[PDB]
Amino acid sequence: QPTNGVGYQPYRVVVLSFELLHAPATVCGPKKSTNLVKNKCVNFNFNGLT
Amino acid sequence: NCTFEYVSFKNLREFVFKNIDGY
User: What single string gives the DSSP state of each residue in A10-29?
Assistant: First the structure.
């Protein structure tokens, strides 16, 4: 009911139920990437090649 | 089940198929 107190009001709920099994990882975290600096000695990573 | 889907004579079309028990 629209008049219900907050404990008796409806809430929409989701569980993001993860799994990690014999089947390979189809989901992974983000590839957060830097600006590019040339002509200086640096550490670098390109597509996981360090 | 139905758990996945994907989309991508002078001539011949060539095809190869293989699977890593799920990949």
Answer: ------------SS------
- Joined together, the tokens standing for residue B23 give 């990949």
> How far is it, in rounded angstroms, from Cα B13 to Cα B11?
7
**Resolution in angstroms for this experimental structure?**
3.0
Q: How far apart are CA A19 and CA A25, in angstroms?
A: 9
Cβ–Cβ contact B9 with A under 8 A? no
Give the residue among B18, B22, B4 at the shortest CA–CA distance from A23.
B22
What method was applied to determine this entry? cryo-EM
Assign residue A47 a region: left if phi > 0, alpha if psi is -120 to 50, beta otherwise?
left
Q: Which chain B residue has its CA at the smallest distance from A25's CA?
A: B23
